[PDB]
Amino acid sequence: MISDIRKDAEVRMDKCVEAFKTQISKIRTGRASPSLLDGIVVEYYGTPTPLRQLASVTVEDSRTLKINVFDRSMSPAVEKAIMASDLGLNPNSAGSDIRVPLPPLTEERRKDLTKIVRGEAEQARVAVRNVRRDANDKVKALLKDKEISEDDDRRSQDDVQKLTDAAIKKIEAALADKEAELM
Amino acid sequence: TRNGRDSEAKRLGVKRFGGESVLAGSIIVRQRGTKFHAGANVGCGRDHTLFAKADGKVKFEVKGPKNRKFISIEAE
RNA sequence: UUUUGUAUAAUGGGUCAGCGACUUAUAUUCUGUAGCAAGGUUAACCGAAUAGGGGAGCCGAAGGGAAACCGAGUCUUAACUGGGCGUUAAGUUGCAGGGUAUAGACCCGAAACCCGGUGAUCUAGCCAUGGGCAGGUUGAAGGUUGGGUAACACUAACUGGAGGACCGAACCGACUAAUGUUGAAAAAUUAGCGGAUGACUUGUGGCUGGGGGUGAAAGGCCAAUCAAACCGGGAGAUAGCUGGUUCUCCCCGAAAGCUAUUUAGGUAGCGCCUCGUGAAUUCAUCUCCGGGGGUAGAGCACUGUUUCGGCAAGGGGGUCACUUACCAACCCGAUGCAAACUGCGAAUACCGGAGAAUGUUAUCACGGGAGACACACGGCGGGUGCUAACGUCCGUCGUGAAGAGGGAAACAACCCAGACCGCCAGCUAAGGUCCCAAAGUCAUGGUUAAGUGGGAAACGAUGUGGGAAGGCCCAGACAGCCAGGAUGUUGGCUUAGAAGCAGCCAUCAUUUAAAGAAAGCGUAAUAGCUCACUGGUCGAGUCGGCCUGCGCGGAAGAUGUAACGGGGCUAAACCAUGCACCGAAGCUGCGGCAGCGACGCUUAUGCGUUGUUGGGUAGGGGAGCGUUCUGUAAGCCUG
RNA sequence: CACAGGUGGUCAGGUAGAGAAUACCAAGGCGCUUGAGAGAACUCGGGUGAAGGAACUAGGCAAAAUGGUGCCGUAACUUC
RNA sequence: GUUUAUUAAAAACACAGCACUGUGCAAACACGAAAGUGGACGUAUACGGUGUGACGCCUGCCCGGUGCCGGAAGGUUAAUUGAUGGGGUUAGCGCAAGCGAAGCUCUUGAUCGAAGCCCCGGUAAACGGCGGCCGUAACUAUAACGGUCCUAAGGUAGCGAAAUUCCUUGUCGGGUAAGUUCCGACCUGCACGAAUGGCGUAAUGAUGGCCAGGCUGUCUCCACCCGAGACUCAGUGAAAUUGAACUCGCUGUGAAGAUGCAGUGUACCCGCGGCAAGACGGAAAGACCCCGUGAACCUUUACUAUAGCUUGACACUGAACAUUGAGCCUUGAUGUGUAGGAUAGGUGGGAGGCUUUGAAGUGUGGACGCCAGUCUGCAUGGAGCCGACCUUGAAAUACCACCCUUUAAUGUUUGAUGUUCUAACGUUGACCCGUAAUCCGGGUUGCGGACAGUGUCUGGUGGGUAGUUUGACUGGGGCGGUCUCCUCCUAAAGAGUAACGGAGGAGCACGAAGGUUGGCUAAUCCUGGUCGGACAUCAGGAGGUUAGUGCAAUGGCAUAAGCCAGCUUGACUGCGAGCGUGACGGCGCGAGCAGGUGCGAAAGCAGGUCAUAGUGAUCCGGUGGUUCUGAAUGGAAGGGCCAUCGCUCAACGGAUAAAAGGUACUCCGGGGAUAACAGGCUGAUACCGCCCAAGAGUUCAUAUCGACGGCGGUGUUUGGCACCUCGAUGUCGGCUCAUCACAUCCUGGGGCUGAAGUAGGUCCCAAGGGUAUGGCUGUUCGCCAUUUAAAGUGGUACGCGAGCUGGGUUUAGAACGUCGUGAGACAGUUCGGUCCCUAUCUGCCGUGGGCGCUGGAGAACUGAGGGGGGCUGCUCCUAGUACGAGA
Numbered sequence A: 001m002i003s004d005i006r007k008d009a010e011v012r013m014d015k016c017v018e019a020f021k022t023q024i025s026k027i028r029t030g031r032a033s034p035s036l037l038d039g040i041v042v043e044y045y046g047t048p049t050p051l052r053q054l055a056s057v058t059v060e061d062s063r064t065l066k067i068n069v070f071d072r073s074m075s076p077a078v079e080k081a082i083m084a085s086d087l088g089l090n091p092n093s094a095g096s097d098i099r100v101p102l103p104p105l106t107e108e109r110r111k112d113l114t115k116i117v118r119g120e121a122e123q124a125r126v127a128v129r130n131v132r133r134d135a136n137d138k139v140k141a142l143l144k145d146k147e148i149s150e151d152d153d154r155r156s157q158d159d160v161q162k163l164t165d166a167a168i169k170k171i172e173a174a175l176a177d178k179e180a181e182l183m
Numbered sequence B: 001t002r003n004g005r006d007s008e009a010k011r012l013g014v015k016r017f018g019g020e021s022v023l024a025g026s027i028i029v030r031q032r033g034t035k036f037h038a039g040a041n042v043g044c045g046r047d048h049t050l051f052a053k054a055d056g057k058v059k060f061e062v063k064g065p066k067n068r069k070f071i072s073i074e075a076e
Numbered sequence C: 001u002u003u004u005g006u007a008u009a010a011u012g013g014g015u016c017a018g019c020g021a022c023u024u025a026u027a028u029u030c031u032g033u034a035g036c037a038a039g040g041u042u043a044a045c046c047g048a049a050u051a052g053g054g055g056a057g058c059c060g061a062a063g064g065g066a067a068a069c070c071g072a073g074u075c076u077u078a079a080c081u082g083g084g085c086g087u088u089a090a091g092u093u094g095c096a097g098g099g100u101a102u103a104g105a106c107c108c109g110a111a112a113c114c115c116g117g118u119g120a121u122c123u124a125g126c127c128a129u130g131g132g133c134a135g136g137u138u139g140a141a142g143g144u145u146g147g148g149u150a151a152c153a154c155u156a157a158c159u160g161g162a163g164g165a166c167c168g169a170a171c172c173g174a175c176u177a178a179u180g181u182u183g184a185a186a187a188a189u190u191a192g193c194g195g196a197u198g199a200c201u202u203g204u205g206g207c208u209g210g211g212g213g214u215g216a217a218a219g220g221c222c223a224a225u226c227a228a229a230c231c232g233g234g235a236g237a238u239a240g241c242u243g244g245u246u247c248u249c250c251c252c253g254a255a256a257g258c259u260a261u262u263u264a265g266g267u268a269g270c271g272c273c274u275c276g277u278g279a280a281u282u283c284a285u286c287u288c289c290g291g292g293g294g295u296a297g298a299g300c301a302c303u304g305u306u307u308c309g310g311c312a313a314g315g316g317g318g319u320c321a322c323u324u325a326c327c328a329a330c331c332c333g334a335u336g337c338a339a340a341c342u343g344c345g346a347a348u349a350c351c352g353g354a355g356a357a358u359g360u361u362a363u364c365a366c367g368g369g370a371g372a373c374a375c376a377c378g379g380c381g382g383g384u385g386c387u388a389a390c391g392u393c394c395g396u397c398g399u400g401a402a403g404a405g406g407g408a409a410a411c412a413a414c415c416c417a418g419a420c421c422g423c424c425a426g427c428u429a430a431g432g433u434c435c436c437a438a439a440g441u442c443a444u445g446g447u448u449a450a451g452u453g454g455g456a457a458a459c460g461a462u463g464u465g466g467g468a469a470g471g472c473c474c475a476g477a478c479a480g481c482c483a484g485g486a487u488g489u490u491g492g493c494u495u496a497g498a499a500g501c502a503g504c505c506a507u508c509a510u511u512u513a514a515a516g517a518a519a520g521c522g523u524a525a526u527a528g529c530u531c532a533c534u535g536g537u538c539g540a541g542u543c544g545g546c547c548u549g550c551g552c553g554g555a556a557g558a559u560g561u562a563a564c565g566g567g568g569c570u571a572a573a574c575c576a577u578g579c580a581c582c583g584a585a586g587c588u589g590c591g592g593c594a595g596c597g598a599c600g601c602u603u604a605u606g607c608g609u610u611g612u613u614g615g616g617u618a619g620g621g622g623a624g625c626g627u628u629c630u631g632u633a634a635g636c637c638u639g
Numbered sequence D: 001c002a003c004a005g006g007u008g009g010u011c012a013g014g015u016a017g018a019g020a021a022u023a024c025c026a027a028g029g030c031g032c033u034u035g036a037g038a039g040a041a042c043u044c045g046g047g048u049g050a051a052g053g054a055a056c057u058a059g060g061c062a063a064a065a066u067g068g069u070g071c072c073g074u075a076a077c078u079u080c
Numbered sequence E: 001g002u003u004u005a006u007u008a009a010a011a012a013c014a015c016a017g018c019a020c021u022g023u024g025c026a027a028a029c030a031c032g033a034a035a036g037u038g039g040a041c042g043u044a045u046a047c048g049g050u051g052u053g054a055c056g057c058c059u060g061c062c063c064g065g066u067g068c069c070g071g072a073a074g075g076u077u078a079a080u081u082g083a084u085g086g087g088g089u090u091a092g093c094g095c096a097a098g099c100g101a102a103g104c105u106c107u108u109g110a111u112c113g114a115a116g117c118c119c120c121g122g123u124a125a126a127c128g129g130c131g132g133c134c135g136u137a138a139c140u141a142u143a144a145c146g147g148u149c150c151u152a153a154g155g156u157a158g159c160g161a162a163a164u165u166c167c168u169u170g171u172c173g174g175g176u177a178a179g180u181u182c183c184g185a186c187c188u189g190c191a192c193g194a195a196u197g198g199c200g201u202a203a204u205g206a207u208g209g210c211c212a213g214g215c216u217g218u219c220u221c222c223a224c225c226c227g228a229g230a231c232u233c234a235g236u237g238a239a240a241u242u243g244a245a246c247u248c249g250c251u252g253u254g255a256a257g258a259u260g261c262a263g264u265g266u267a268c269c270c271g272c273g274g275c276a277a278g279a280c281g282g283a284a285a286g287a288c289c290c291c292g293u294g295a296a297c298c299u300u301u302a303c304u305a306u307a308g309c310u311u312g313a314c315a316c317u318g319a320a321c322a323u324u325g326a327g328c329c330u331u332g333a334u335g336u337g338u339a340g341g342a343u344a345g346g347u348g349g350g351a352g353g354c355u356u357u358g359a360a361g362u363g364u365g366g367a368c369g370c371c372a373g374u375c376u377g378c379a380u381g382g383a384g385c386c387g388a389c390c391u392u393g394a395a396a397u398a399c400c401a402c403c404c405u406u407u408a409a410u411g412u413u414u415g416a417u418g419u420u421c422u423a424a425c426g427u428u429g430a431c432c433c434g435u436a437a438u439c440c441g442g443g444u445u446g447c448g449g450a451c452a453g454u455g456u457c458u459g460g461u462g463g464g465u466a467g468u469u470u471g472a473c474u475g476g477g478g479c480g481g482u483c484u485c486c487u488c489c490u491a492a493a494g495a496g497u498a499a500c501g502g503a504g505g506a507g508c509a510c511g512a513a514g515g516u517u518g519g520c521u522a523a524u525c526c527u528g529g530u531c532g533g534a535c536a537u538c539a540g541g542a543g544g545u546u547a548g549u550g551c552a553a554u555g556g557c558a559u560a561a562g563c564c565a566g567c568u569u570g571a572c573u574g575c576g577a578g579c580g581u582g583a584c585g586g587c588g589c590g591a592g593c594a595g596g597u598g599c600g601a602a603a604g605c606a607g608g609u610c611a612u613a614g615u616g617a618u619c620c621g622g623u624g625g626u627u628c629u630g631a632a633u634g635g636a637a638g639g640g641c642c643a644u645c646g647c648u649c650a651a652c653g654g655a656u657a658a659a660a661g662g663u664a665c666u667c668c669g670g671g672g673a674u675a676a677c678a679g680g681c682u683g684a685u686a687c688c689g690c691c692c693a694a695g696a697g698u699u700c701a702u703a704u705c706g707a708c709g710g711c712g713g714u715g716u717u718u719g720g721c722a723c724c725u726c727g728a729u730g731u732c733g734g735c736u737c738a739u740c741a742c743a744u745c746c747u748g749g750g751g752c753u754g755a756a757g758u759a760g761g762u763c764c765c766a767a768g769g770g771u772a773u774g775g776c777u778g779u780u781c782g783c784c785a786u787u788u789a790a791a792g793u794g795g796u797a798c799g800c801g802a803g804c805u806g807g808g809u810u811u812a813g814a815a816c817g818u819c820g821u822g823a824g825a826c827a828g829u830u831c832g833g834u835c836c837c838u839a840u841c842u843g844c845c846g847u848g849g850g851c852g853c854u855g856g857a858g859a860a861c862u863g864a865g866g867g868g869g870g871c872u873g874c875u876c877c878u879a880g881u882a883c884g885a886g887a
């Protein structure tokens, strides 16, 4: 009945938002953001797996970013792994901490980059909006097969709305501070 | 789920009590089990109802080791 | 009027006058009444006509059975020990009344259905026959000519005068806005506006007719009316709905429930009311006697739910069936919880036997007439809800309903109390007694000081009463003032610094009267610094838990004080006791009327004393008034 | 209704005018069957309006505005 | 161009053009019981119908469903024909019991029988339809690709946030200072898409949306002027309305929003002009909503009829020849299961018929034929093939019987098709007379011709038409759900007791699972025990009915009602003292009596089942018995009496044998008995506040905050309720004019600050005044631009239509999406769409009259009391000072 698609609609949604958060994690703002490296493909001596399984992705300041590691025979091995990976980060081999700098918001970055997140935001909305479409298609469907009451439909067609609405609030307000990381 | 139905009342119980008058054939108690039992001149029916096989006075009592209730009729 | 309920801001009525609604006919039953009686009575008709004839016929004295049949019996059944229905109960015909059946059947009222007629003088379409379109534009085809071509194509003038063509009056229309909206007008006026040679516009006459027409199609038009015209009919269609229902006095007096229902705002049987007939101490209260209870409450053996402990299979994990940190059933002990648990188990309630008082038979049966089956609030027990609702659904009682009076400011439903009538008399109830405003500025003992009283909780506070106990203290306590407050010692300390020191660890170890390796101000770390502790000083009380009354904060709303009715109250508040008084349509006292009994005088019973009853809606029962008309009446009153 | 509505055909003067539009006139016909005064709000119909110019409003509703003839001259698009 | 005369002029209708389809003329078609008439004095280059809607580029896939167009082989079938059997009667045979001739009669219904349907085929510019799921690309993401299911088949071209888009103000872009609209994109098309047409299009348009110049009193923000009313005077003289009025406020009360109640406050008497907050003001028995076993029209695969259309039979209706669909059929054949001296009748007789009264098998003139085989007209043939054969579930075409399969011809016989004929009948060909007549009749003639057509009967079709139906309960209705029956709880220790209250079960089973006699005794745990576990069976102990009851629950049950056996039919017929329970109809219990059984030695027990569900009235009719009835009599028929049969009449006391829907085109009777606005009750929810203090706050709980929890206040959100109003309380927003609260937005006065200054934060006090213009949308709201000291939150019928507006929103028009077969429908969207009222009372703004104030008059006053006003920026000096490292 409605029950096991009210909860079904719900999981599909608040796991829709937790992809957005996840794909505005692979952008480069001014700020340090260690979760930038903490999702990078990297080889080392046998198998893939990110650098999570090797170094601490720490910080030095808002505009720089220390890489505390254990083992000092792969410093060039990862350096290239990082310095060829669609980011544009030249790591200094100052020794010890693979210094990766954070070059500033160049304004053609405060913008156009910003345009990307609030676009990526929008498509995350669309996915949610479409969980909506389905969720109550099931509702509407199990009505014209007399298993619901008009009332029970109506109170289920809304509330699905309540799920969309709130779920958007999460998308929108996770984007909104992420916009502060440049504005 | 759907509740909301029940049977008719079957209007059971004691019909003539202790030391009532009552002529033979009259019913003394409707019951489902033999909550009461048949004493002297009071034959239990297929109902489990206890009528009387003699004009007389009703008498409740309790004999035996299971301590169960018997309806007698004191002769009259 | 309708309602649970109406000043209701719910219906109806501008007022008066006159008219305006339970009838008529025939059956049928009951009642009253009259005659005749195991008989009663005739109908049509005759009639010499309310007579008298006429007894066809109807009802009754006999029933039982499906019937044949039998008959004071019969049926049942092979038959009944028996059972069902009858015999033990007078009927019938008029007259008056109460119902019912058929009828319009109290009156008014639909939207509609059917029949037959009248309507195309409005309007839709069509058919004949006649009218109408100022003025100004553009310039199709076609023609002529010249240029051009190898000839055509091509091109230029000029001519010509097409078009549901252009602008624009008349005429046709009706997009906008104001006005008008008891108009100048039941669809217009004013300023703008679309068409204006066309599928245009208009005059006369004609044709199409109602489930029919007509429709460049809106359900539009068919005479100010159209999802079926108008007029007359069937017709007083039907109205389980709404409204209304007209004189007076007496007695009783409900229901808003059950059960069934194309049933739910209707109806029927039952319940309840009324009237009649009849019948036993019938019925009720209380007393004793004979009964079954499984509810309140409690309990945890059962069923389940549950916490601690002990005990433990197994379950969960380490092995290469074992150990096990861990979640652990059963049993055991301690402890709770239950509408659908009970080894317990009340109070009430109910049934039955007896008995006395009282009770206007209050009881049962039968019969005549009903009404009613929308309930409401309150108390108590509950389901529902939120132990929300002026909520909803049951049980039980009370009141309103259908009941006035006094109280609760006002306030159907609460408190008090049941109004036959008169009284310028009396006692009370509930509620009251400072003024409004009838009666205590009453008596005594407390409390509160907040206008608490006269609105609100968790919680907060040396408010202020009462009670029983505690600790400390002239070997000097409680506060205050004087002082000391030192040294293991930085304490070691992952201590970059902490030594009380966000941290570190323990907190044990010197000393003296006493001073924590530490209570906080606190430093970069020192630390300057008060504490705790102790000596003095002062000199008799001080400390804070328990039980308890009253009060304080917690406390913000909208028109106006507006959270005692008001004034105002420090008692005019609160608690306790007492005695007074005021207070009602209650009780009493006089006087009167009526229904029902009783005694005494006395019969158609008047009656004296007396006992008792007399709110009332639906509704039943009883008794009258007055109007018009007939007889009495050629009487009587009357210029 | 002595109703600001409806009602088919005829006639076609002067000046301006393209005109049967329109203004003024002729011929002819009328002032509309309650008057008198006042010179408030407010409504009705109208005139003018500083600076601003759609800020109004659902909306430029309403108003304001353009308006004749002659000659120059005129873009996209087009079924030419 | 047309249209809702009188709220809609549009995107609606018409249109030319396109297509589908029907019509050979006495056209189809329409009006006409008919005659006739239109169509048309037309003739397929015509006429009718349906859809589309100039033009341009185009118009895809789907025939399964419903339609329509073809079919025939059968299957099924009408009237009709009346085979065949059954029965009534009674001449006669009968001791009687019976039997039963004809005839007359009541049945039964062989055979014949068309279309339709079944079925097969076609058709979409017929109605109409055009999918799901699962995976897949070196990172992600997506999926050109694969799989699978389902279909009739799964949306091509073009188009797309649209007249279509819910979420939506989608996102991006432009335009603007600011744009819910607009324009350009995108595609995530809830739910576009190809003549119920798709996509474009110059021109047209009192058509929908957006922008810009000009212009302006539309607006900042109103001023002045001219006129018609309004005002005064004279003349004439209405209206709705009206229980009655001696007709104030405030706060409470109250049928719940008070001139009239309670308390209180204020108020000398009466007009005139003005305003519209109130008298739930006027007007119209509310249109919304619901109810009525109300009404209309309307739709349809609702029901029942029916005109029409169509099939056959009989009649009108005659004469002739032939063909063949055929039930059946004498002359007679028709024929390999597995193991064959072989293409074996169900299975049998049975011991020479044909030869002599013309026959092998080697050709095959006829030929079946699965081209594998063969009977053998006429004889060739010129005196014996051969059979129970040793195989076979069974031995010979060795002779002959009716023939399960198949097949073939007389007679004729079921009945169908064809031709010819002319004399019925038709003639909407010509000519003739009545007759100077496109009617009519008669006559001649040609054509047609027993056809057509018509009447009676009969199958089908039949929303063309007509009559109706389409339940109720319900915390309004609808939607869901429910409707009889049984058990527990609610149920307040007798009975009973309601809700859309909390839980479950029944619409049967069993010939034994019934009867009786005899006998027997569980569950669970512990211990031992092969497969063997928590539990299969065995042993023992504990246990003691926790098991078992055919099944829900409750009551029962050891004397068992539980379990086994033997014998059995009491799962008996008549009755029934006396009770139980029902308004009733009914339902239940019952000893005992009669008769007749079974079981037991006997006492006794048995009229179904441990009990409580397991069911359906009456009518109507079937069946069996029974002289009870019997329309002159005898019989019969029919009726009665007994037994029994037919119903998810379940909406389960069953309105019919027989029934669904629309109405926004609507209508009428009703109701505040009953929903929607506003009020009232409530306060779960909301909002505002408070209690506790782990924690955040570098350290520190309370500067600022605060988890797990807790207590309130308000009336103020979402709600619940149905008290008021349905003989009418106009709904959102705007405008104008407001008025109160304080939970204070600014300005004023303070405390704490994690307050240096400046500027903040939080709290207390404070309601005096003040508290924005715009873009967008109907919006309140909100986002946005830009101001301001600030752009406060509430109450006031979510203040304010007898003050304005009419954008939103609910009438009638229209359309798109979507739903429906349709009428229509949407709490979807789009374009259009009549806003009445002259003020009696209250109140209010103004302004007069009267009287009083004590003899009267003229002034000037005192001021009890009432109202008005009460806002705030910047700059500057103080001073570049205090403070600050500076800024």
Ligand SMILES: NC[C@@H]1O[C@H](O[C@H]2[C@@H](O)[C@H](O[C@@H]3[C@@H](O)[C@H](N)C[C@H](N)[C@H]3O[C@H]3O[C@H](CO)[C@@H](O)[C@H](O)[C@H]3N)O[C@@H]2CO)[C@H](N)[C@@H](O)[C@@H]1O
Residues within 6 Å of the ligand: E085
């Ligand atoms: N071809 C048969 C025809 O029968 C006719 O006779 C008719 C009647 O006479 C005859 O009726 C006879 C009856 O008479 C005689 N007494 C008894 C016989 N059983 C009946 O026969 C009839 O009745 C039986 C039922 O009983 C039915 O099956 C059916 O109607 C008929 N067979 O049945 C015939 C019709 O059914 C004529 N004889 C004649 O036209 C011709 O022969």
Ligand SMILES: NC[C@@H]1O[C@H](O[C@H]2[C@@H](O)[C@H](O[C@@H]3[C@@H](O)[C@H](N)C[C@H](N)[C@H]3O[C@H]3O[C@H](CO)[C@@H](O)[C@H](O)[C@H]3N)O[C@@H]2CO)[C@H](N)[C@@H](O)[C@@H]1O
Residues within 6 Å of the ligand: E131, E146, E154
């Ligand atoms: N119209 C253009 C085409 O549209 C296609 O669209 C098709 C796809 O989206 C989709 O195809 C899927 C296929 O991808 C998937 N892997 C398997 C699935 N069975 C297919 O389904 C398709 O094909 C099968 C027949 O085999 C049909 O049954 C089904 O209706 C159809 N949708 O179904 C659509 C066809 O109906 C593709 N986009 C591409 O081939 C092309 O663009």
Ligand SMILES: [Mg+2]
Residues within 6 Å of the ligand: C003
């Ligand atoms: Mg009422």
Ligand SMILES: [Mg+2]
Residues within 6 Å of the ligand: none
């Ligand atoms: Mg009443």
Ligand SMILES: [Mg+2]
Residues within 6 Å of the ligand: none
């Ligand atoms: Mg009252």
Ligand SMILES: [Mg+2]
Residues within 6 Å of the ligand: none
């Ligand atoms: Mg009033």
Ligand SMILES: [Mg+2]
Residues within 6 Å of the ligand: none
């Ligand atoms: Mg009134």
Ligand SMILES: [Mg+2]
Residues within 6 Å of the ligand: none
């Ligand atoms: Mg009224």
Ligand SMILES: [Mg+2]
Residues within 6 Å of the ligand: C012
């Ligand atoms: Mg009235």
Ligand SMILES: [Mg+2]
Residues within 6 Å of the ligand: none
């Ligand atoms: Mg005419």
Ligand SMILES: [Mg+2]
Residues within 6 Å of the ligand: C165
């Ligand atoms: Mg023209």
Ligand SMILES: [Mg+2]
Residues within 6 Å of the ligand: C168
């Ligand atoms: Mg024009």
Ligand SMILES: [Mg+2]
Residues within 6 Å of the ligand: none
């Ligand atoms: Mg119009």
Ligand SMILES: [Mg+2]
Residues within 6 Å of the ligand: none
């Ligand atoms: Mg005009």
Ligand SMILES: [Mg+2]
Residues within 6 Å of the ligand: C224
């Ligand atoms: Mg008209």
Ligand SMILES: [Mg+2]
Residues within 6 Å of the ligand: C228
């Ligand atoms: Mg009609």
